[PDB]
Write a protein that binds this ligand. Structure first.
Ligand SMILES: Nc1ncnc2c1ncn2[C@@H]1O[C@H](COP(=O)(O)OP(=O)(O)OP(=O)(O)O)[C@@H](O)[C@H]1O
Ligand SMILES: Cc1cccc(C)c1OCCSc1nc2ccccc2n1CC(=O)O
Ligand SMILES: Cc1cccc(C)c1OCCSc1nc2ccccc2n1CC(=O)O
Length: 289
């Protein structure tokens, strides 16, 4: 059927800058005809063409248009003018998960469990659609007004082809602290690469820093490939067990991966015994302090 007319910049009142990326800016905007607030991500055509970023921008639009789940930032609309491309996104009022990790230092067990469960639920949805995120990290996990997660940053994501039963993707993308050993060694990622990142994030929620850390990327890569990390004292024992089952060098042996029979066994892990998986997005999140 028809859709709402394409929006234009003059349909909005723009407000504050919410953040700046290397080739994008996100601005808070109110749509004049509805009074709705959106986070509008704006890119300059000349700049993305000159810097060979067109594929990333197209990837982000294509992947986000496929998503329809409460734990992901929503793409409501797109438009362009002579100079710019615009994405109309849901506004995650409470910002990045990373901010809360730093402010609090270490999440308690109830908060670690709840936020971990939301991320697992999101990944189950994404993987079920054959999509690999490839850059999962706390900066890319936003929080809405109700303190539920909103995963974002899909320009480096990959839709695996169902037609060829594709399992592996060949683009070198991600963030050093969270990149999987298979990407470093075999130069390909798979859905299980996101489960490695999950393990790093759970560790970081409890420990305050991700497990493989160093002052530069090459040093981090060396630690990843050797599984060189340790747990701090008082790390919740069931969480430690879970992390140890995700931070596994062989991507086919990570809990939650297809070769380990999927999300059922992961959701059944003892760390999640008290979780009600069915309706997490309607549960009230535990207070962080
Ligand atoms: N939907 C949103 N709601 C609220 N804030 C957002 C939203 N999307 C992005 N932001 C904020 O804007 C920042 C800039 O996002 P953008 O995607 O332009 O770049 P980036 O991912 O931070 O940087 P780079 O692209 O260089 O990695 C984000 O880091 C985030 O803090
Ligand atoms: C992708 C692209 C990059 C640079 C310059 C141009 C001319 C260009 O084509 C836009 C054609 S359609 C389009 N592709 C998008 C990719 C991200 C966000 C908005 C987007 N829109 C405009 C739209 O969807 O209405
Ligand atoms: S910056 C910063 N602030 C923090 C507060 C608590 C724990 C770690 C913290 N880091 C370093 C980081 O996030 O890598």
């Amino acid at each position: 059927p028809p859709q709402p007319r394409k929006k234009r910049p003059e349909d909005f009142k723009f407000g504050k800058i919410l953040g700046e990326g290397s080739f994008s800016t996100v601005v808070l905007a109110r749509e004049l005809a509805t009074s709705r607030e959106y986070a509008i991500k704006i890119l300059e055509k000349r700049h993305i063409i000159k810097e060979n970023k067109v594929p990333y921008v197209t990837r982000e639009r294509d992947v986000m248009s496929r998503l329809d789940h409460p734990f992901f930032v929503k793409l409501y609309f797109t438009f362009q003018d002579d100079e710019k491309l615009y994405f109309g996104l849901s506004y995650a009022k409470n910002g990045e998960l990373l901010k809360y990790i730093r402010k609090i230092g270490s999440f308690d067990e109830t908060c670690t469990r709840f936020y971990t469960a939301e991320i697992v639920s999101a990944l189950e949805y994404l993987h079920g659609k054959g999509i690999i995120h490839r850059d999962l990290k706390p900066e890319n996990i936003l929080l809405n007004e109700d303190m539920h997660i909103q995963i974002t940053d899909f320009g480096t994501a990959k839709v695996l082809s169902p037609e060829s039963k594709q399992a592996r993707a060949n683009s070198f993308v991600g963030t050093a602290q969270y990149v999987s050993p298979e990407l470093l060694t075999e130069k390909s990622a798979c859905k299980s690469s996101d489960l490695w990142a999950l393990g790093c994030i759970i560790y970081q929620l409890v420990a305050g820093l991700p497990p493989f850390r160093a002052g530069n990327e090459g040093l981090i890569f060396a630690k990843i490939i050797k599984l060189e990390y340790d747990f701090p004292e008082k790390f919740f024992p069931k969480a430690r067990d879970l992390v140890e089952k995700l931070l596994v060098l062989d991507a086919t042996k990570r809990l939650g991966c297809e070769e380990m029979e999927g999300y059922g066994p992961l959701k059944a892990h003892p760390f999640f015994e008290s979780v009600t998986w069915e309706n997490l997005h309607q549960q009230t999140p535990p207070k962080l302090t």
